[PDB]
Design a protein around this ligand. Sequence first.
Ligand SMILES: Nc1nc2c(ncn2[C@@H]2O[C@H](COP(=O)(O)OP(=O)(O)O)[C@@H](O)[C@H]2O)c(=O)[nH]1
Ligand SMILES: [Mg+2]
Lengths: 165, 156
Amino acid sequence: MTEYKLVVVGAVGVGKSALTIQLIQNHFVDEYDPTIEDSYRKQVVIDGETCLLDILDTAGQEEYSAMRDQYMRTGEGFLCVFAINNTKSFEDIHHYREQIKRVKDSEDVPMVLVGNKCDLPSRTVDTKQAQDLARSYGIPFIETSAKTRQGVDDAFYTLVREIRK
Amino acid sequence: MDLGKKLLEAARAGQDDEVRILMANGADVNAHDTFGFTPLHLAALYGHLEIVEVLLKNGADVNADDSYGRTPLHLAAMRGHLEIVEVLLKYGADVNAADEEGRTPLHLAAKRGHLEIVEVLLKNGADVNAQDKFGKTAFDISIDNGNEDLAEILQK
Ligand SMILES: Nc1nc2c(ncn2[C@@H]2O[C@H](COP(=O)(O)OP(=O)(O)O)[C@@H](O)[C@H]2O)c(=O)[nH]1
Ligand SMILES: [Mg+2]
């Protein structure tokens, strides 16, 4: 069965770990420690092909990581996560996309833009602004809620579909 | 009064004074957040040796595990906190403890490239050949990463 090395990137507190745990464990976490960088795995069925997900949930980017750099060189898809209530996280997408382009040495890498915490009533980051950025990058944009599971499978599924292409 | 939260925070932040005081007023060394981190997990993860010891000496559970099955030893290995790994063992940490994926501390250290910790775990009776629930072992991880120095340790 096929293995996909997925990298989850984005600013601290956007809900990367909360997304990873909702996908693999089917449970929401409030409080998950913000510097634990682990790679969780998950067997799924995507479009009739049993396949294995090997997801790195980046944390602690402040400090250096041997295994994080190795995941970045080798990784196959990227989830670029921002929070819909954090304008700084949206701005940081620019730096993450550019960093991926440089480590991978390629204008075209499998990527999905994720606007997390869409379960939330107040929203500082407009749907059009996010859709325009994804449309300028030529990549899908998916709204997600790690709390309600909305769009969570879709985000990880679409990325696997983008690697197949 | 919720001194469990006040103790966890203190353990993470490396405030050995606040930890001493908090326990003196009967704060529970096996408090845990909504994902099962004990003060020991946090101290280990964040590299706080004096705090790790004072927690253990005060009866903290060394083989406590979070809701993904990780012991404090797992986390100490994860980060490459060598002197902590040793004292966790000296106080009875299970070397071959397996998280929800079946990974032992050897897998995690091997995977991060923490070779000094791999050497020490093996010396305390780590099982070189244990498979996680997807079949992988330390040696699978060395080949999967092209890590030459690790694959060497795992033979001669
Ligand atoms: N309402 C809501 N809260 C979330 C969501 N995702 C994460 N959070 C919360 O935001 C905090 C940060 O999540 P975390 O996974 O630590 O993000 P990370 O720091 O990127 O790994 C936690 O308290 C989560 O409960 C979401 O989709 N909706
Ligand atoms: Mg996190």
